[PDB]
């Protein structure tokens, strides 16, 4: 079946780095045409997409953290690393992840993660 | 994005890198992938008794061993199925010819059967089982084992009148020879008179035969021939022989049947093996429709084509391939 | 190398394929696939087995003729002995050829036209998914994965539910 | 910044048509911008419904549908029960990023 | 073995649209399947709605209608009324054979 | 009207021939595009389609139980006979023998009858 | 056991076809179209005569011949003639078989493709107003009654005139 | 059902099919289904023998060579031209036995002749006795002898060579049947003969032939030890056949007329019925529509050729593809 | 006067180039050529025959007396019946071996053409239709150019699909 | 003009105004643009002598040149490979006839050779070199030139026993004769005896005969007859010769071979082409495969048919242009 998992500090302080790790099975990154997103809620708000990594190592990312956001992946072990740096605030909020498919006529965020709350003080 | 929905499903044939060639009603050279030679040119080099009863021959016609020759006197009452002349044959016995050779080698061939009964002639008045110093049995002189000279008496030949019927349910062949002398003398010393003459008939058929005298060339220290005439009687019918002199005399009936037997002149030995065609050269496999070995054959045997080869293709054309 | 699946049924043929006679090359994103077709074949084997047993081991049993050589020398019989002879010879040599010249013809236009239906056959259930061009091969829409060519292969190909995506390429 | 804004919250009882729009600072939406909706129940997953606009994931039941209503993008629902008690958004793409939508809040008469 | 699955249970108000589909396991659903829906009242007989995928039986009200959606056949009730609380059933024909799926229970709020 | 009635033993025991008679009055198996089909629900379960026999004797039934099912019609008298064999606790359900009407684009599944109870027990 | 456009020369035979040979059969809006057609049942009867004529009443003469059986046996003489008949009568019964048998292939070759041309005939008759499923049977669109079948077997069936409905019951 | 539209059609192109079609050969396969086979070969037979087209002539227990010399009971065949001679397997000679050399060569020719027209001719015989007769063939109760052939016999115990000639000036050939009787002992020769030796010899102006007679005994048939062996004579136009003979010689009483027609011999035991047909053959008569043949291998007349197989079907239709499951 | 048509209803006498031709109306008027492969073809398998049995003699010397004039028994018999027999199996081997390469003949070069009218065929793939007597209404207009193309094999479909699928459709 | 987008591209095949007919495996009546002709039914009408050596009749038959008669002397060891024998021969010698005429004319035939040697015969006390008178040389009167007529010597015969043995390598043939009187006072007066008896023999075959005394027709002027017989001679063998009168001797032998010499009955004039077939009526071409002419040939010819004509097609069909339309 298809199941994404987060995992992540949860607690940390301001001016920090973020290192969050989403562990995914079912469906193998070798596969044509399949992505996974990433999406978080800051608990009161509406959703903001921020980042997604494709399976021929294109990415794609929010122009309004270009500066403070890495994303990577680990297609043996089928693991996703999300970077995000200088922390604030305005970054605690609710971390998940998700998978997109690329298919003909659109992409589709069909399956998405439990989620990861972050708390940042 | 669009996947291209393209697809080849490129469909192709068998081809093969070494194909031989084979005609076409149109074309002479048309490589085919794979193709069966047709005729047979090639034989085994012996003659297999598996299917057929083969009587070597050991340097003895078939005309010797009827008579009773002193070398084929093993072939006494013998069967077959191919009688085999070998090359090497040879007459050691008395001089003889037989008119029509051709057609007493044939009959007896075909019908395979050599078995002589002695019958119950009653030859009396001369003194038969007469010797001859040219046809010697392994100790002393001999004539025929198939046949009696009839020789004189004390200065007395009388006019011989031996009648014989044929009650029986097969056909009878009776082999009576006629002795030519090459003087009058001799003439006059074995069968004291100066004429002769032999007459047997039937109630078909009548043989009436004059002896000549007369000079021939020596062979084997005997100046004199012997000529051969067979005879066959019908189921029913009577034989009756009269003669004045200069008559070789039956011992008895050889039996006459028709079959499958038939002969052939061939210096291969006899071996083993499992086929139905017997050559001069040999033996060869019946599976091919045709060959070229000889043109002599016997039994379910393939025709006798001119052409060397013949190849039927067993395939389709195969157009080389790609390369590079 | 250049792959392409360059020829079959023109050109050149194949030489890899052992295990059949006419066989399908297909190239998509899966890669190259391979395998014969064993109905096609069958009907070019059978004819084939249709002239070996008529031939091979069809022999009649002749058990005495004349003879055929001769070491002396006659007159009219021995003549016509040899004349009879030869007569019988040039018909049976004349009845090859034709026999085996015949039998070539027929299975050369049989091989090409059984394996022609073979081609044909694909190209009728390819109405309109499909294109045709000088080399045999095809042009298959939709994307045509593992599932058309055996769908193809044992018949069960429906034209009509890709029916409406093939008319794109061919709209261009 | 290409915002994307949907309406606050919506209303119905249990069986009524519930149509959803995603509008947006830029303009027009075609069928280039990548049209998505997924929903937010209380107490489970987030669970992706219709992709492309017009791509729907399957798995979902067939009364919710996705279509392009003049110039702009629309969910429909035909018929919604008291499961259908969550938080619906909306997702479009600007050819290099996705901006995610405020929000639709559908509250179902239980 | 093609087996016919649909929806466990739909509900509705008195007036509102219900969509129940028809899927088969064997693959594309078209009009050579002739997708036939009766449905069954707990006193009524069967009657039967749409056959041939397009075609209505006479006499039932207009509010029922069949068509193809996508890859499975559908059949729609355009304000559904308090007497449509009752069973629905689909059948395919798989050139051989009728299969019939495992029934929906359009239930309907008249209480 | 279109009217169809069925006609069965009710309860039979483990291992019996089942024989199920169809009635039905408004038309005849004479017209071309008329048939009659049988349909069983086992009263809690889904619904079986059986067997059905065309105007011009035509036979389909389930694959299923193609070894175990025979059924005819009988146009004089305006009939139809179902028959089970080696009938079970499976085959315990209420039939139906309804009308099926063959026309241009599909069959139409009309008209159908009020059915017979069918229990299968040892008791 | 029911009539739902049967298909033609690859798949079946009819047996409701015996005025004529090559026959159609539509279903059109009316519904039945079995009905004979002419050029194509008589050019496959011509070949068919044509090797019967030659083949009966083509008797040669032959009045004295030598004795085929003999009650008496004889040397090389009676042993030729009957070699003389056996090599006759085995050399005409290869030539029987093999004639009957050439015969035979060139007639069911000539009337396959005797149909095969009359189908193509009419595929090359329809340019795109019809295409085919693959089973000899056209599907044809637009208004299409008796008289409009009934022209396309006579040899007029204008193509253009029936141009707009065809290209809308097709690509587009 | 049926599904279709108003306006889509079929035009569904087909053949013709039998539910029984017939087994016959081709050269790829054996077992192919055609609509009808026609047989190429006649198995069947009438039974009997018609002469519609020909003029066939019946045995009646007479072989034609016994005609030919002139048996009694074969007196009914005298100058009757046929087209084709029927030798009956119930055929035996009831007159003075006899043999021929090249039994086969006289039967051939004159049965090819096909015209027995005889012309008694005035031989010059001076110093003989002619009309010799035998006890072994009787004609009207009487005893006789060949009705053709003329037995000498001396008249004062005394037999002068016989120097007779006759040319030939007619524009066709001349055939000459004559013998030379053996004798049974040498007293029965000096008392038929009146001579201890014998010589025969005849010519023309191409060839020449010289028998010597065979005295000695020969077995009984018919109550007569003796035997006469008849020869034939081809005399060409303008030709001479001179005979000089000092005895046992077989007077012929004149010539036969030869030609080269379609005239032949057959040995069936099959009768005589009334029909219209070509074919004869010793089981009968066969049509000859057919263009093959298996009855037996002598034949007559318009004939299809003999093979030696049973039955040849010949295609006349197209391929059998019947059912379908219906 | 114009509108020619090919293979269905008639060749001409116009050409004797070859055996096999092809024939263009265009803009610049009355075009007509021969090609050198089914040509070639169909001469090559036609002199195939012509090799087999012009020039082919089998050696006889001494052979039986075919006439007689003096009138014998079975030898004469015997040698003119084994000659009548020779002769006739002669004179149907003749017969048959004529009436088959006739046919394949006739056959042979009906089906070779037909190649090259397939040949021709799927070279336009769709940038031209059928007309049913041996013409192709070929679309996107062009000059004589194209002609020695087709001959050569050199026709690029692709190139020209933009007008060959606007005079078609629509 | 034509710029509308249309084009045309017909195809076809090429038509002759006069087409031939040619027949199939059926319906005959079809029409081919070109045929080729197969069965020769024409021949030029003069054998001529390019291959092979043709020596001419000259009223001359195989058996008179072999005996050399006085009209046919210019034949003396003269090699051929065809006898070709005119219908105008006849004999001007003494009378004879032989036993089996087509079986030695046949042998002689096929040797090709009748280079004739002189064996010096070692004969006793009888007259040679007899001399008839119906068979003229320069009006000397003459007989048979490979033959030897022997008489009494003063009133006797002592009968031969004369033998030639044979030691060369290639076979040897005998022609000799055996002479027939007409009454028993032409036998005493010539031969001496009133019987006779004529014996060969060889090491594996042997010959009889004896002569017949009796009257024949009257041919040029001869009551009486001649019988010829003919004897070969393997290699190694002995030719064994007894007689007591009544014997025409050879005086040598006549070599034969095997090769591919034979007869021809024509009338046929001679003449030079370049041709391997002869025929009675001609000489004919071989480039075709089959002929009418005649059945009797000699050489590489073409087989023997009873057609008149056989086209083959060397074209293909010729459907008519029928005009312009
Ligand atoms: C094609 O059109 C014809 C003509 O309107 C239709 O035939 C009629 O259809 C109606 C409606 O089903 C029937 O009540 C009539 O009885 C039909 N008339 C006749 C004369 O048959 C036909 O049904 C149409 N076909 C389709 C597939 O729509
Ligand atoms: C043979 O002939 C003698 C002498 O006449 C006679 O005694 C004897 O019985 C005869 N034998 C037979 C078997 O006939
Ligand atoms: C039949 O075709 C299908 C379609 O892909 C293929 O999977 C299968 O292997 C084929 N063979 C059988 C025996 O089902
Ligand atoms: C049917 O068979 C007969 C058999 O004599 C044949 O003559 C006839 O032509 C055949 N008819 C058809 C229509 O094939
Ligand atoms: C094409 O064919 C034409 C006509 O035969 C010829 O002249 C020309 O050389 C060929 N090649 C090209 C490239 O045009």
Known sequence: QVTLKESGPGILQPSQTLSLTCSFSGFSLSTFGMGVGWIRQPSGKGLEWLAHIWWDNDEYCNPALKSRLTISKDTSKNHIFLKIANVDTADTATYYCARIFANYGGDAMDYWGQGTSVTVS | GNDNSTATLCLGHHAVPNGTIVKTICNDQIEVTNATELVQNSSIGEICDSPHQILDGENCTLIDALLGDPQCDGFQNKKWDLFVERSKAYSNCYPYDVPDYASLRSLVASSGTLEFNNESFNWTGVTQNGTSSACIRRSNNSFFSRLNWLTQLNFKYPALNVTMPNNEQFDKLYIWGVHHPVTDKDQIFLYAQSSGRITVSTKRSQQAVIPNIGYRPRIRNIPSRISIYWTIVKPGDILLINSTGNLIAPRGYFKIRSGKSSIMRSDAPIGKCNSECITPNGSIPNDKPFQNVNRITYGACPRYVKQSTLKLATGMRNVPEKQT | ?172 | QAVVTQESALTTSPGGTVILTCRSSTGAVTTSNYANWVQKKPDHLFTGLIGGTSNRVSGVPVRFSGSLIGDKAALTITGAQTEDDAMYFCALWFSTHYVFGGGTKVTVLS
Not at chain 3, 133 to 162: E, L, P, Q
């Open chain 3, 1 to 172: 190398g250049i792959f392409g699946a360059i020829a079959g049924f023109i050109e050149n043929g194949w030489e890899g394929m052992v295990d059949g006679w006419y066989g399908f090359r297909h190239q998509n994103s899966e890669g190259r696939g391979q395998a014969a077709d064993l109905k096609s074949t069958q009907a070019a084997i059978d004819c084939i087995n249709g002239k070996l047993n008529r031939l091979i081991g069809k022999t009649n049993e002749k058990f005495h003729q004349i003879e055929k050589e001769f070491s002396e020398v006659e007159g009219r019989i021995q003549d016509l002995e040899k004349y009879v002879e030869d007569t019988k010879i040039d018909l049976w040599s004349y009845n090859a050829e034709l026999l085996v010249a015949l039998e070539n013809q027929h299975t050369i236009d049989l091989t090409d036209s059984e394996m022609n239906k073979l081609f044909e056959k694909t190209k009728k259930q390819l109405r309109e998914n499909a294109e045709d061009m000088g080399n045999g091969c095809f042009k298959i829409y939709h994307k045509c994965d593992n599932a058309c060519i055996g769908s193809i292969r044992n018949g069960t190909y429906d034209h009509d539910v890709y029916r409406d995506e093939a008319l794109n390429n061919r709209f261009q």
